[PDB]
Amino acid sequence: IPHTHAHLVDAFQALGIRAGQALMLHASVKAVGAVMGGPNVILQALMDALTPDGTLMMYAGWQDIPDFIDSLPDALKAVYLEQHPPFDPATARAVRENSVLAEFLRTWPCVHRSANPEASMVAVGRQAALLTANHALDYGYGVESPLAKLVAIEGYVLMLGAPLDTITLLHHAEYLAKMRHKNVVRYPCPILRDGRKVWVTVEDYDTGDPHDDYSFEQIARDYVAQGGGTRGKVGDADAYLFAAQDLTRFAVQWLESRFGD
Amino acid sequence: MTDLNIPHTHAHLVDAFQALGIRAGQALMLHASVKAVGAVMGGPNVILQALMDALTPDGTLMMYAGWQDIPDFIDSLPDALKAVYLEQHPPFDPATARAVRENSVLAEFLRTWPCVHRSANPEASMVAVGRQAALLTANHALDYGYGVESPLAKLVAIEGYVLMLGAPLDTITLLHHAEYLAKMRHKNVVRYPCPILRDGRKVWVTVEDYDTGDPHDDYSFEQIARDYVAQGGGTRGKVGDADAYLFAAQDLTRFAVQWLESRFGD
Ligand SMILES: CN[C@H]1C[C@@H](N)[C@H](O)[C@@H](O[C@@H]2O[C@@H](CO)[C@H](O[C@H]3O[C@@H](CN)[C@@H](O)[C@H](O)[C@@H]3N)[C@H]2O)[C@@H]1O[C@H]1O[C@H](CN)[C@@H](O)[C@H](O)[C@@H]1N
Ligand SMILES: [Cl-]
Ligand SMILES: [Cl-]
Ligand SMILES: [Cl-]
């Protein structure tokens, strides 16, 4: 008895999903268990609960981003600079980890994808263009980003069996928080400009390691423990539903009270 | 979005600990987030009381304390300021030194308990109550505080357990003992100053240890533990509102050492 479309819709609504919401999804397709019609039915079920007036977004990134070329032998780097393809939002594949549904969402009609290669987001639904447009290359989790806009339209984050450590929105809280010190990274990336490949330097806060003695798992568990969000079962997966505005405010205060200057 | 609970009772915490697998006479190291458990009838001390009730007086309960105010950073200060720290900063006083800032409410509660014992190493300080509290905390060397002369080594040797109570597995102090034990291609060795009490007087000493602030290679503690649970390490169960985990110290240490050595070892 694999989970049916209807069964998942009702579990989404029991958790708190409602028509018209803008939401960002993090999922582990494995944790949900078998679904009748396969993993795409998870998305169809979710968009059914959201209705066409709602919006669904996921983090895609770019699996093949060649941001490591400086650590290669000079001779190999030269080959990358000539032969590695640029970020193409039409065909660039999503990061491997917890992303089967993101790759699925990229074949949906009317999908939008933001232009920042490393921080690329995909979205479908009413506010999909708004969320994804004019995504700055530098500080791609900052003020000119789909995360900033998700907070601004009072959207949500849904964890569908995905670990609390993987909440991309918390990088936006890192961006906002006034902290003693934040690590800056500067790395190369080929992109399309007027149809032609150009390599640029991208500047960003480091998102590979926390800027201080904390983890996102820590912050999220502290949030849930003080009453943040709702928790519930969806298929076989443990699910959480958070308000983006409230989570971001909580996380910024959390970081500023422990690591401010 | 989720309302607070009707307070958990002592009795219902004892039951939950027994259902998790806590048994009389065990020696336990506890990692807890008090808020994860939810409201408790009587406050956070009842968690400790219920756990010791599950363990009986024949059991032992240990937690990591450390020293929140350790002035181990004073070599990175300008000369004049460093001189002020050297003259004015208090020494580590086991009686009053406060535990590190996070997940330590219960460790701080443990320090007001009668018959509590505190190990002597300031940065790696452990607190314990119960039958083997003295044995576990005895003769904790100042150098290599997570090594052979540590409460963690003794916890493994007497085949104790580690109990997660809503704390991230990231924070299992025992994993620093695994780092000590593992033969790895690269290790960071640090020397830092610390004021202690010798014969009632403040004296500054230099402590030598492995760096425990950064990993010695490309890994994180969350990696190792998540890999440990994924392959069936320990038992799981609810305690109050918290998701709990119960590990055998010996098994987790062996796993984490093999984990490190297979990736970075000889
Ligand atoms: C041993 N003295 C210093 C030696 C020096 N070589 C270290 O760099 C320095 O560590 C920095 O401070 C850590 C805070 O943990 C950061 O590590 C974190 O960084 C994240 C992401 N980057 C993860 O890598 C990792 O999980 C860590 N949580 C490090 O950048 C040490 O001091 C600290 O560690 C002492 C012992 N525990 C404490 O007593 C001190 O109060 C002080 N916090
Ligand atoms: Cl997945
Ligand atoms: Cl997110
Ligand atoms: Cl705590």
XYZ file of C-alpha atoms and ligand atoms in Angstrom:
573
model
C 0.000 0.000 0.000
C 2.088 2.918 -1.247
C 1.035 6.379 -0.151
C -1.609 7.879 -2.415
C -1.894 11.432 -3.692
C -4.952 11.957 -1.438
C -3.246 10.537 1.649
C -0.317 12.955 1.232
C -2.559 15.979 0.583
C -4.414 15.358 3.836
C -1.157 14.865 5.770
C 0.106 18.176 4.329
C -3.084 19.900 5.459
C -3.026 18.268 8.911
C 0.479 19.721 9.289
C -0.714 23.186 8.388
C -0.212 23.654 4.638
C -2.926 25.934 3.250
C -4.038 27.311 -0.108
C -2.007 30.298 -1.279
C 1.092 29.773 0.879
C 4.567 30.355 -0.534
C 6.763 27.590 0.737
C 10.266 26.245 0.437
C 10.565 22.446 0.604
C 13.449 20.328 1.941
C 12.837 16.606 1.455
C 14.325 13.149 1.715
C 12.338 11.026 -0.736
C 13.531 7.910 1.114
C 12.050 9.014 4.453
C 8.595 9.492 2.915
C 8.389 5.866 1.845
C 6.847 4.430 -1.284
C 4.384 6.708 -3.052
C 1.828 5.537 -5.617
C 3.085 6.995 -8.891
C 6.559 7.755 -7.544
C 8.303 10.811 -6.066
C 6.662 13.318 -8.398
C 3.349 12.594 -6.695
C 4.831 14.148 -3.544
C 5.132 17.423 -5.469
C 1.723 17.134 -7.159
C 0.154 16.458 -3.761
C 1.933 19.467 -2.224
C 0.939 21.805 -5.098
C -2.617 20.508 -4.823
C -2.747 21.588 -1.166
C -1.082 24.906 -2.055
C -3.434 25.291 -5.126
C -2.230 27.281 -8.176
C -2.339 30.414 -5.993
C 0.462 29.075 -3.803
C 4.135 28.791 -4.598
C 6.644 25.966 -4.128
C 10.408 26.564 -4.095
C 13.455 24.388 -3.557
C 17.182 24.890 -3.394
C 18.890 23.498 -6.508
C 22.367 25.007 -6.632
C 24.651 23.551 -9.289
C 26.158 20.091 -8.854
C 28.985 20.784 -11.309
C 30.057 24.253 -10.115
C 33.842 24.376 -10.744
C 34.599 26.612 -7.746
C 37.618 24.420 -6.857
C 39.783 25.009 -9.925
C 42.436 27.072 -8.071
C 43.324 24.001 -6.013
C 44.012 21.961 -9.174
C 47.350 21.703 -10.990
C 47.823 24.801 -13.148
C 47.718 22.675 -16.305
C 44.365 21.175 -15.303
C 42.915 24.537 -14.278
C 43.742 25.841 -17.771
C 41.672 23.011 -19.261
C 38.735 23.836 -16.987
C 38.909 27.471 -18.050
C 38.642 26.472 -21.720
C 36.319 23.438 -21.595
C 34.078 23.451 -18.488
C 30.564 24.583 -19.508
C 28.973 27.615 -17.834
C 25.984 27.625 -15.533
C 22.937 27.179 -17.789
C 19.752 27.519 -15.715
C 17.850 25.437 -18.292
C 20.069 22.339 -17.986
C 22.336 22.785 -14.948
C 21.666 19.898 -12.609
C 20.844 20.342 -8.933
C 23.190 19.393 -6.103
C 23.073 15.615 -5.481
C 22.169 15.606 -1.804
C 18.445 15.593 -0.916
C 17.406 16.833 -4.304
C 15.467 14.196 -6.245
C 12.435 16.444 -5.985
C 14.359 19.560 -7.062
C 15.438 17.758 -10.229
C 11.818 16.655 -10.660
C 10.563 20.233 -10.198
C 12.879 21.378 -13.031
C 10.783 19.444 -15.587
C 7.517 21.021 -14.451
C 5.935 23.445 -16.912
C 6.378 27.093 -15.915
C 9.298 26.395 -13.543
C 11.517 29.385 -12.740
C 15.188 29.183 -11.785
C 17.234 31.967 -10.173
C 20.491 33.095 -11.749
C 22.969 32.620 -8.889
C 24.738 29.339 -9.786
C 25.818 28.211 -6.304
C 22.617 29.370 -4.575
C 20.207 28.629 -7.441
C 16.547 28.138 -6.475
C 13.735 26.566 -8.531
C 10.101 27.495 -8.051
C 6.633 26.829 -9.443
C 3.381 28.612 -8.686
C 1.921 32.083 -8.439
C 4.950 33.904 -6.986
C 7.589 31.735 -8.715
C 8.931 34.573 -10.891
C 8.945 37.038 -7.998
C 10.896 34.677 -5.748
C 13.522 33.803 -8.388
C 14.103 37.046 -10.285
C 17.161 39.317 -9.896
C 19.046 36.918 -7.646
C 22.393 38.669 -7.092
C 25.617 36.773 -7.799
C 27.411 38.132 -4.737
C 25.968 37.326 -1.298
C 23.398 34.988 -2.818
C 21.692 34.274 0.533
C 21.510 38.000 1.394
C 19.247 40.960 0.694
C 18.789 40.333 -3.068
C 17.826 36.696 -2.857
C 14.827 34.347 -2.978
C 15.247 33.768 0.751
C 14.890 37.484 1.509
C 11.777 37.519 -0.635
C 10.354 34.372 0.981
C 10.615 36.133 4.334
C 9.081 39.288 2.849
C 5.967 37.516 1.554
C 5.570 35.638 4.872
C 6.280 32.219 3.401
C 7.098 28.913 5.052
C 9.762 26.228 5.191
C 8.625 22.569 5.149
C 11.093 19.876 6.257
C 9.907 16.590 4.736
C 12.154 14.003 6.347
C 15.175 16.246 5.665
C 17.620 16.952 8.517
C 17.187 20.188 10.437
C 20.863 20.990 9.653
C 19.941 21.497 5.960
C 17.627 24.524 6.294
C 19.049 26.856 3.651
C 17.053 29.788 5.082
C 19.377 29.874 8.098
C 22.202 31.065 5.772
C 20.030 34.162 5.274
C 19.880 34.500 9.059
C 23.680 34.252 9.067
C 23.762 37.025 6.475
C 21.550 39.351 8.534
C 23.030 38.732 11.992
C 25.518 41.235 13.400
C 28.295 38.858 14.433
C 31.805 39.190 15.829
C 33.228 37.654 12.646
C 31.954 36.083 9.404
C 34.153 34.284 6.884
C 34.108 35.712 3.341
C 34.844 33.521 0.326
C 35.754 34.583 -3.198
C 35.623 31.928 -5.904
C 35.490 31.597 -9.709
C 32.490 30.521 -11.752
C 31.573 30.448 -15.469
C 28.187 31.970 -16.282
C 26.309 33.065 -19.391
C 26.439 36.755 -20.334
C 24.707 37.738 -23.595
C 24.845 34.131 -24.743
C 28.584 33.637 -24.188
C 30.618 31.977 -21.447
C 32.395 34.347 -19.053
C 34.229 33.404 -15.856
C 33.587 35.756 -12.922
C 34.595 36.025 -9.290
C 31.721 35.410 -6.837
C 31.899 36.898 -3.340
C 29.818 35.442 -0.531
C 29.751 34.526 3.095
C 31.109 31.017 3.569
C 28.232 28.523 3.646
C 30.395 25.416 4.094
C 31.173 25.984 7.775
C 29.490 28.042 10.515
C 31.045 31.417 11.308
C 31.306 30.583 15.021
C 30.600 27.787 17.546
C 27.120 26.841 16.410
C 25.293 24.532 14.033
C 22.007 24.893 12.166
C 20.756 21.683 13.847
C 21.352 23.420 17.194
C 19.416 26.540 16.175
C 16.493 24.622 14.690
C 16.168 22.275 17.688
C 16.234 25.302 20.020
C 13.498 26.827 17.847
C 11.264 23.747 17.968
C 11.888 23.370 21.714
C 10.556 26.864 22.501
C 7.374 26.135 20.540
C 8.507 27.040 17.020
C 6.575 25.586 14.097
C 4.417 22.480 13.884
C 5.549 18.881 13.617
C 3.703 15.939 12.090
C 3.856 12.803 9.983
C 3.762 12.867 6.163
C 3.888 9.406 4.649
C 6.589 7.772 6.718
C 8.559 11.014 7.198
C 8.889 13.239 10.240
C 7.776 16.660 9.012
C 8.191 20.207 10.334
C 6.515 23.409 9.144
C 8.086 26.759 10.040
C 7.114 30.357 9.395
C 10.044 31.889 7.474
C 9.676 35.314 9.094
C 9.527 33.914 12.641
C 12.345 31.395 12.108
C 14.614 34.069 10.610
C 13.929 36.517 13.433
C 14.511 33.760 15.995
C 17.746 32.674 14.344
C 19.187 36.190 14.013
C 18.537 36.906 17.710
C 19.965 33.473 18.543
C 23.208 34.239 16.697
C 23.454 37.839 17.895
C 22.964 36.997 21.559
C 25.738 34.374 21.476
C 28.227 35.768 18.955
C 27.682 39.517 18.812
C 30.526 41.979 19.270
C 2.810 27.236 16.602
C 3.259 24.361 19.105
C 2.029 24.926 22.675
C 3.922 23.907 25.802
C 2.999 20.670 27.597
C 1.415 19.830 30.942
C 4.538 19.362 33.075
C 6.220 15.952 32.933
C 6.288 14.183 36.276
C 9.241 12.568 37.983
C 7.462 9.191 37.634
C 6.810 9.573 33.917
C 10.456 10.527 33.320
C 11.629 7.462 35.272
C 9.370 5.267 33.127
C 10.698 6.874 29.940
C 14.296 6.284 31.037
C 13.550 2.649 31.834
C 11.814 2.175 28.463
C 14.890 3.628 26.751
C 17.052 0.995 28.430
C 18.506 2.709 31.510
C 19.251 0.032 34.106
C 20.224 0.076 37.764
C 23.941 0.425 38.352
C 24.916 1.795 34.942
C 27.480 4.543 34.555
C 26.090 7.213 32.237
C 27.426 10.348 30.556
C 24.542 12.750 29.901
C 24.208 15.259 27.051
C 20.962 17.190 27.454
C 19.111 20.215 26.175
C 16.761 21.079 29.050
C 14.320 22.964 26.805
C 13.994 19.986 24.412
C 12.509 17.902 27.237
C 9.661 20.376 27.816
C 8.164 21.675 31.022
C 8.912 19.363 33.967
C 6.926 19.332 37.215
C 9.494 20.804 39.579
C 11.973 22.126 37.020
C 15.152 20.769 35.430
C 16.473 19.167 38.640
C 13.642 16.611 38.437
C 15.215 15.301 35.214
C 18.380 14.625 37.203
C 16.426 13.143 40.134
C 14.403 10.888 37.832
C 17.554 9.727 36.032
C 19.356 8.931 39.290
C 16.182 7.127 40.372
C 16.369 4.979 37.236
C 20.071 4.408 37.921
C 19.670 3.936 41.755
C 22.483 5.063 44.123
C 24.471 2.143 42.614
C 24.571 4.043 39.315
C 26.771 6.919 38.210
C 25.839 10.063 36.267
C 28.540 12.216 34.594
C 28.413 15.366 32.553
C 30.818 17.687 30.805
C 31.371 20.997 32.627
C 34.551 22.525 31.229
C 35.185 26.100 32.347
C 33.212 28.871 30.640
C 35.665 31.558 31.772
C 38.925 29.780 30.842
C 41.351 32.532 29.760
C 42.957 30.251 27.174
C 43.048 33.068 24.573
C 45.382 35.509 26.307
C 48.413 34.922 24.078
C 46.480 36.584 21.224
C 46.130 39.774 23.337
C 48.451 42.796 23.338
C 51.101 42.850 26.057
C 49.450 45.282 28.458
C 46.047 43.609 28.394
C 47.660 40.199 28.734
C 49.462 41.483 31.844
C 46.072 42.413 33.343
C 44.679 38.933 32.717
C 47.779 37.373 34.277
C 47.414 39.420 37.444
C 43.626 39.749 37.767
C 41.869 36.757 36.150
C 40.677 34.204 38.770
C 42.027 30.634 38.784
C 39.952 27.565 37.987
C 38.108 26.843 41.235
C 36.359 23.441 40.896
C 33.834 24.481 43.524
C 32.661 27.635 41.755
C 33.901 27.491 38.149
C 30.854 27.702 35.956
C 30.229 25.197 33.172
C 30.391 26.073 29.467
C 27.467 28.081 28.091
C 25.439 25.578 26.015
C 23.495 22.470 27.062
C 24.828 22.912 30.588
C 21.771 23.747 32.746
C 21.857 20.199 34.094
C 25.627 20.283 34.603
C 25.174 23.466 36.639
C 22.373 21.799 38.621
C 24.663 18.821 39.237
C 27.183 21.141 40.944
C 24.709 21.955 43.751
C 24.082 18.242 44.325
C 25.479 16.671 47.501
C 28.405 14.310 46.945
C 29.199 15.748 43.502
C 32.770 15.266 42.208
C 34.570 17.485 39.687
C 37.641 16.472 37.703
C 40.723 18.721 37.930
C 41.416 19.514 34.245
C 39.872 22.997 33.723
C 39.108 22.884 30.005
C 37.954 19.235 30.032
C 36.344 19.317 33.500
C 33.709 16.680 34.203
C 31.120 16.546 36.996
C 29.680 13.321 38.358
C 27.435 11.942 41.097
C 26.878 8.378 42.184
C 28.771 5.204 42.886
C 31.729 5.737 40.528
C 31.755 9.547 40.616
C 35.086 9.619 42.477
C 36.687 6.931 40.314
C 35.623 8.610 37.064
C 36.855 12.088 38.018
C 40.083 11.082 39.810
C 43.531 12.115 38.539
C 42.344 13.872 35.372
C 45.665 15.033 33.950
C 46.037 18.642 32.855
C 47.717 17.570 29.571
C 45.697 15.760 26.867
C 42.451 16.198 28.792
C 40.478 13.881 26.490
C 43.202 11.180 26.438
C 44.294 8.176 28.462
C 44.166 9.995 31.816
C 40.626 11.317 31.410
C 37.123 10.518 32.707
C 36.178 9.534 29.147
C 38.854 6.842 29.015
C 37.584 5.519 32.353
C 33.961 5.654 31.184
C 34.914 3.454 28.233
C 36.969 1.151 30.470
C 34.092 0.513 32.906
C 31.766 0.073 29.877
C 29.515 3.041 30.585
C 26.933 4.626 28.335
C 26.235 7.966 26.675
C 22.662 9.302 26.920
C 21.543 12.004 24.467
C 18.577 13.979 25.768
C 17.622 16.319 22.934
C 21.215 17.515 22.408
C 22.894 17.425 18.970
C 25.090 14.378 18.514
C 27.739 16.914 17.396
C 28.339 17.606 21.091
C 29.351 14.113 22.310
C 32.559 14.930 24.215
C 33.610 11.284 23.916
C 34.319 11.967 20.222
C 37.287 14.079 21.357
C 38.622 10.933 23.077
C 38.228 9.122 19.737
C 40.303 11.887 18.090
C 42.988 11.341 20.727
C 43.092 7.591 20.178
C 43.010 7.574 16.353
C 46.300 7.345 14.435
C 45.849 10.124 11.878
C 48.058 11.675 9.208
C 47.807 15.175 10.756
C 47.103 16.442 14.266
C 47.146 19.951 15.722
C 48.900 20.149 19.119
C 48.320 23.322 21.134
C 49.830 24.925 24.192
C 47.817 27.498 26.108
C 47.970 29.146 29.549
C 45.545 28.474 32.346
C 45.406 29.742 35.959
C 44.764 26.980 38.523
C 44.891 26.497 42.301
C 47.999 24.816 43.745
C 48.081 24.565 47.557
C 45.414 27.263 47.848
C 47.323 29.718 45.612
C 46.724 30.853 42.044
C 49.410 29.632 39.660
C 49.578 29.940 35.904
C 50.518 26.803 33.969
C 50.743 25.928 30.307
C 48.427 23.130 29.192
C 49.344 20.961 26.207
C 46.567 19.220 24.286
C 45.206 18.391 20.891
C 43.236 21.297 19.504
C 39.578 20.546 20.318
C 38.229 23.640 18.583
C 38.918 22.581 15.029
C 38.975 19.063 13.572
C 42.349 17.549 12.697
C 41.252 16.826 9.103
C 38.217 17.030 6.785
C 35.458 15.735 9.047
C 32.867 16.956 11.519
C 31.507 15.305 14.632
C 28.000 15.386 13.130
C 29.297 13.226 10.251
C 30.664 10.546 12.544
C 27.622 10.278 14.801
C 25.109 10.391 11.952
C 27.073 7.545 10.349
C 27.011 5.738 13.721
C 23.224 5.930 14.111
C 22.638 5.056 10.443
C 24.215 1.638 11.017
C 22.230 0.915 14.170
C 24.350 2.224 17.042
C 22.362 2.481 20.253
C 18.679 2.617 21.147
C 16.130 5.415 20.673
C 13.049 6.547 22.512
C 11.163 9.579 23.769
C 12.011 11.235 27.082
C 9.552 13.990 27.855
C 9.306 15.944 24.625
C 12.877 15.034 23.669
C 14.161 12.444 21.260
C 16.741 10.433 23.170
C 19.596 8.125 22.217
C 21.450 5.597 24.420
C 24.940 4.487 23.303
C 27.497 2.128 24.750
C 30.622 4.248 25.294
C 32.948 1.431 24.234
C 31.116 0.743 20.951
C 30.861 4.409 19.963
C 34.561 5.020 20.699
C 35.654 1.991 18.650
C 33.397 3.043 15.765
C 34.589 6.651 15.745
C 38.265 5.618 15.909
C 37.843 3.191 12.988
C 35.881 5.915 11.187
C 38.781 8.370 11.578
C 41.586 5.877 10.907
C 39.947 4.430 7.797
C 39.683 7.918 6.289
C 42.861 9.596 7.581
C 44.762 6.815 9.312
C 47.726 4.609 8.575
C 42.173 25.518 22.078
N 42.258 26.997 22.091
C 42.027 27.546 20.727
C 43.084 26.986 19.774
C 42.856 27.486 18.354
N 43.844 26.844 17.468
C 41.445 27.137 17.872
O 41.260 27.596 16.525
C 40.350 27.712 18.777
O 39.081 27.267 18.262
C 38.250 28.231 17.584
O 37.103 28.431 18.415
C 36.269 27.300 18.146
C 34.918 27.305 18.844
O 34.552 25.923 18.970
C 36.208 27.300 16.628
O 35.853 26.019 16.119
C 34.495 25.874 15.700
O 34.468 26.135 14.288
C 33.391 25.481 13.620
C 33.214 26.063 12.218
N 34.439 26.763 11.798
C 33.695 23.985 13.604
O 34.898 23.762 12.851
C 33.858 23.416 15.024
O 32.792 22.497 15.356
C 33.995 24.474 16.139
N 32.746 24.534 16.942
C 37.657 27.626 16.297
O 37.694 28.496 15.161
C 40.584 27.281 20.243
O 39.721 27.983 21.150
C 38.372 27.518 21.246
O 38.275 26.166 21.746
C 38.630 26.010 23.129
C 38.680 24.521 23.500
N 37.411 23.824 23.195
C 37.679 26.844 24.004
O 37.977 26.717 25.408
C 37.767 28.323 23.605
O 36.806 29.096 24.351
C 37.596 28.535 22.091
N 36.177 28.501 21.693
Cl 15.802 12.935 -1.908
Cl 15.275 26.832 3.730
Cl 20.503 22.829 28.725
